[PDB]
Write a protein that binds this ligand. Structure first.
Ligand SMILES: [Cl-]
Ligand SMILES: [Cl-]
Ligand SMILES: [Cu+2]
Ligand SMILES: [Cu+2]
Ligand SMILES: [Cu+2]
Ligand SMILES: [Cu+2]
Length: 501
């Protein structure tokens, strides 16, 4: 028997309060705490690692150009409760390393959360790139859905699965005149798949299928597909909504899983924004794909559906087809709250208006000495000399070629980018020869991808082209696959945005 669906109200994480706020600076403190929270009516409390002891973390709301500082502290225990594989990466390091990355942040390099800028409990020990306790987020960027999460070297999949995710919204007051649904009718949805034991403890696997005798125990796995789906820290919740327009900030905070969402009454979503902010023009959607770290700013118009119960449904597989009783379900909207006031919100169609190098990038896997797949960007390891070195201020086109069997959601820190096109190629030939020979025309982005993206699905047997301008800041960043199981082994590379000064 699987946990009974739709019997816990969707929590709405509280908005973090500043420690200090003047007209020209905002200081926040966030402490990583081991904590316990009940993930379903019928479970005992689950041991979790959460920002301020909460899962998800507090929702952080800033205005565009708000000068924000965050002191992210580690008060976690010194050993992990999830299985650590020592083989993937005065010389014995602490087992628990944390660093916070603001995903989608236009962030100076020393506050971006470099994987090797980790710290242990109370900053007692720190990685090689550690420089500062208090991170600076000048927020000089378009309003959008951001999120924040752990990024420590070789531990990212574990620390995130343990609960260290939160939302961060940048409000651009020049967008207020669109009258998009707001306040109580603006709601974040952080989607996390989890596998939960009978006693409420989290399960994370300590070995993959691969039965080979040489396998380190524990071993990293190439993918994690959870049995149960959570939204805002509750398993298959319901939200009571009013019969009107709502805004939802949908964030995929899962380790590996891709969702493909729809509404079981047949209703439509209106996509208004992507990772990088508002789309140039809205889009009526009946379904959409959402890979790890992707965000979809959307409206749902519950006006025509008073009294109905509507399932937010999932059709994407993860390690097999979806099971209709379990991972085919996300959550349930109940249109049964009395309209508290007239629906003065709007759903405009029109929302906004917007080549020094080419770089070719290969996504491929090799095999380690134990027979495990190691996933790699351009056949380089994390610790190899940096090769992606655009000059600050310059625009490049990245051609990302994927001959592997699966989609990889590729994310670049600091920037958002334009999607140019995707084009299919003959893997067979490309494999055998190195020859990039196409099989059909180039496909331009749908409307969903006509704005700005920071995390982008590079599909099997396609070459993906995107255009990024590498600024405004310079320095040491990263880019990587955002399936955390891939990132940690070893599909992540440093990215130097070079500065003549
Ligand atoms: Cl509103
Ligand atoms: Cl999909
Ligand atoms: Cu991220
Ligand atoms: Cu990021
Ligand atoms: Cu990947
Ligand atoms: Cu990253």
């Amino acid at each position: 028997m699987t946990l009974e669906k739709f019997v816990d109200a969707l929590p709405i994480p509280d908005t973090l309060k500043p420690v200090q706020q003047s007209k020209e600076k905002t200081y926040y403190e966030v402490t990583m705490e081991e904590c316990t929270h009940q993930l379903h009516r019928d479970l005992p409390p689950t041991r979790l690692w959460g920002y301020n002891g909460l899962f998800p973390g507090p929702t952080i709301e800033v205005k565009r150009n708000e000068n924000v500082y965050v002191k992210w502290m580690n008060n976690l225990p010194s050993t992990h409760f999830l299985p650590i594989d020592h083989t993937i990466h005065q010389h014995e390091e602490p087992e628990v390393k944390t660093v916070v990355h603001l995903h989608g942040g236009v962030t100076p390099d020393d506050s971006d959360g470099y994987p090797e800028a980790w710290f242990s409990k109370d900053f007692e020990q720190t990685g090689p790139y550690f420089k500062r306790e208090v991170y600076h987020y000048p927020n000089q960027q378009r309003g959008a859905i951001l999120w924040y999460h752990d990024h420590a070297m070789a531990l990212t999949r574990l620390n995130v699965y343990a609960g260290l995710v939160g939302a961060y919204i940048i409000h651009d007051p020049k967008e207020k005149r669109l009258k998009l649904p707001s306040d109580e009718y603006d709601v974040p949805l952080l989607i996390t798949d989890r596998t939960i034991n009978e006693d409420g403890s989290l399960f994370y696997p300590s070995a993959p299928e691969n039965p080979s005798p040489s396998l380190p125990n524990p071993s990293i796995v190439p993918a994690f597909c959870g049995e149960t789906i959570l939204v805002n820290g509750k398993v298959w919740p319901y939200l009571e909504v009013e019969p009107r327009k709502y805004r939802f900030r949908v964030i995929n905070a899962s380790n590996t899983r891709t969702y493909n969402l729809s509404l079981d009454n047949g209703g439509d979503f209106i996509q208004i924004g992507s990772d990088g902010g508002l789309l140039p023009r809205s889009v009526k959607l009946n379904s959409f794909s959402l890979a790890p770290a992707e965000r979809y700013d959307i409206i749902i118009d519950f006006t025509a559906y008073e009294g109905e119960s509507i399932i937010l449904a999932n059709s994407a597989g993860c390690g097999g087809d979806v099971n209709p009783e379990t991972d085919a379900n996300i959550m349930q909207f109940r249109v049964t709250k009395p309209l508290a006031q007239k629906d003065e919100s709007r759903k405009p169609k029109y929302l906004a208006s917007y080549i020094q190098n080419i770089r070719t990038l290969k996504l491929a896997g090799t095999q380690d000495e134990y027979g495990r797949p190691v996933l790699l960007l351009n056949n380089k390891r994390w610790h190899d000399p940096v090769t992606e070195t655009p000059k600050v201020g310059t625009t490049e086109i990245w051609s990302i070629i994927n001959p592997t069997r699966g989609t990889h959601p590729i994310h670049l820190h600091l920037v958002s980018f334009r999607v140019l096109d995707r084009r299919p190629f003959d893997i067979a030939r490309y494999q055998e020869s190195g020859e990039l020979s196409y099989t059909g025309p180039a496909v331009p982005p749908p409307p969903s991808e006509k704005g700005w993206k920071d995390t982008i699905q590079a599909h099997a047997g396609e070459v993906l082209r995107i255009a990024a301008t590498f600024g405004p800041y310079s320095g040491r960043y990263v880019w990587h696959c955002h399936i955390l199981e891939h990132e940690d082994y070893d599909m992540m590379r440093p990215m130097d945005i070079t500065d003549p000064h």
